[PDB]
A paper describes a structure:
IPNS is part of the superfamily of iron(II) dependent oxidases. Crystal structures of the Aspergillus nidulans protein5, 6, 7 show IPNS to contain the double‐stranded β‐helix fold (DSBH, also known as a “jelly‐roll”, cupin or jumonji C (JmjC) fold) characteristic of the 2‐oxoglutarate‐dependent oxygenase superfamily. These structures reveal the presence of the characteristic “2‐His‐1‐carboxylate” facial triad of metal‐ligating residues (His214, Asp216 and His270), an arrangement present in many non‐heme iron(II) dependent oxidases. Movement of Gln330 enables formation of a salt bridge between the carboxylate of Thr331 and Lys98, with the six C‐terminal residues (Asn326‐Thr331) taking up a position that extends the final helix (α‐10), thus enclosing the substrate in the active site.
Removing the seven C‐terminal residues to create the tailless I325* mutant provides important insight into the mechanism of IPNS catalysis, particularly the role played by these residues in shielding the reactive species generated at the enzyme active site during ACV turnover. Several minor changes are evident relative to the wildtype protein, including minor alterations in the positions of the aminoadipoyl and valinyl side chains of the active site‐bound substrate, and a small rotation in the side‐chain of Phe211 relative to the wildtype structure. Notably, in the I325* structure the β‐carbon of the ACV1 cysteine is clearly exposed to the external solution due to the absence of the C‐terminal helix that would otherwise cover this region. Furthermore, density consistent with a second ACV molecule (ACV2) is observed near the primary, iron‐bound ACV (ACV1). The valinyl and cysteinyl side‐chains of ACV2 appear to be well‐ordered, but electron density for the aminoadipoyl residue was not resolved beyond its Cα atom. Extra electron density is evident adjacent to the cysteinyl sulfur of ACV2; the size and shape of this density suggest another sulfur atom (S′) bound in the mode of a disulfide linkage. A further very small peak of density is apparent at a position that likely corresponds to another atom (C′) covalently bound to the additional sulfur S′. However, an alternative pathway is available in the absence of the C‐terminal residues, which would otherwise adopt a position that extends the final helix (α‐10) relative to the Mn:IPNS structure and enclose the substrate in the active site. Without these residues shielding the reaction centre, the thioaldehyde in 24* is susceptible to attack by a thiolate (or thiol) nucleophile (ACV2) from outside the active site, leading to an enzyme‐bound hemi‐thioacetal/FeIV‐oxo intermediate 29. The formation of 7/8 from reaction of the tailless I325* mutant with ACV provides direct evidence that reactive intermediates generated in this more accessible active site can be intercepted by alternative reaction partners and diverted from the reaction course seen with the wildtype enzyme.
Author numbering: 3 to 322
Write the structure that this text describes.
Amino acid sequence: SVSKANVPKIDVSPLFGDDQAAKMRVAQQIDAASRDTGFFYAVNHGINVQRLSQKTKEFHMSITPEEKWDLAIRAYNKEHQDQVRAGYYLSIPGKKAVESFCYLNPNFTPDHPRIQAKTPTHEVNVWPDETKHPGFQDFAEQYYWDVFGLSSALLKGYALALGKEENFFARHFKPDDTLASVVLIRYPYLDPYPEAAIKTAADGTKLSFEWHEDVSLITVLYQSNVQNLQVETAAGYQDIEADDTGYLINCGSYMAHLTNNYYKAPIHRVKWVNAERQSLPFFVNLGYDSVIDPFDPREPNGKSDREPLSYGDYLQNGLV
Ligand SMILES: CC(C)[C@@H](NC(=O)[C@H](CS)NC(=O)CCC[C@H](N)C(=O)O)C(=O)O
Ligand SMILES: [Fe+3]
């Protein structure tokens, strides 16, 4: 069978407070996990994940085909040319099992200067009808800000881990401008299950999502309690155990760039499981113009031979 990945449970609650030595001890655990498999579970995070799962289920199970077309991104609906990121990503019965809903910063309103300028990667969110989904928009926008707050705390820990002051990343992660997204992904139970929605890895593992690195600074993930993720290590792909009380955290390729691959973006994949489940990532993205000068925490002088890359350039290139 497959070996279990080392994915430690880190109590992140000190990152919300003012005990600086305790925060350093959290930062050390973040450093160790980031140098090993690249994954950890954040525990004691303060977010009501059971209610997130309930509200998400109520949405996924009640939205109708009509509503999905009305909310669809341009890949599924040619009438919606402004929807590249935000909206509904449809299933294709018989072919594509997964479906999802993506939303961006609630502050990206019609009057927001980056919306007025039509800057790439910025869009105004689309929402289902309030009478059909009562409370959903409000819940979802509040969730954005709850996970934003957890992510800001995690970014203080990553900064400390790397020998930086605790606002080194967080100062670029701001409510008025962050490019961060929430995706509410439904993986369905299907009988029979479409073979076209099952991919096969070179090692024979049946997959729902092939190997990749994340397009993010960090990724902050809730999943149901159905084991599915695997991480590539030197010892091969290893199983990430599920924990539906925690958030699974990893670095994305912008972190790898800034740190000269000291904190790698781990390669991971999703196993095929015929189970009704949820995958609810928050992609921690900075602002469009944010630039962090690359560095290397393994070199006496910290210098890297990588060129500065704005987050907007990174994101537009990555989302293709
Ligand atoms: C591994 C999970 C995080 C999940 N997959 C995913 O979320 C995958 C790979 S990280 N996500 C993406 O490709 C990027 C979505 C970006 C989003 N539309 C945005 O505009 O910001 C899954 O369960 O398949
Ligand atoms: Fe991923």
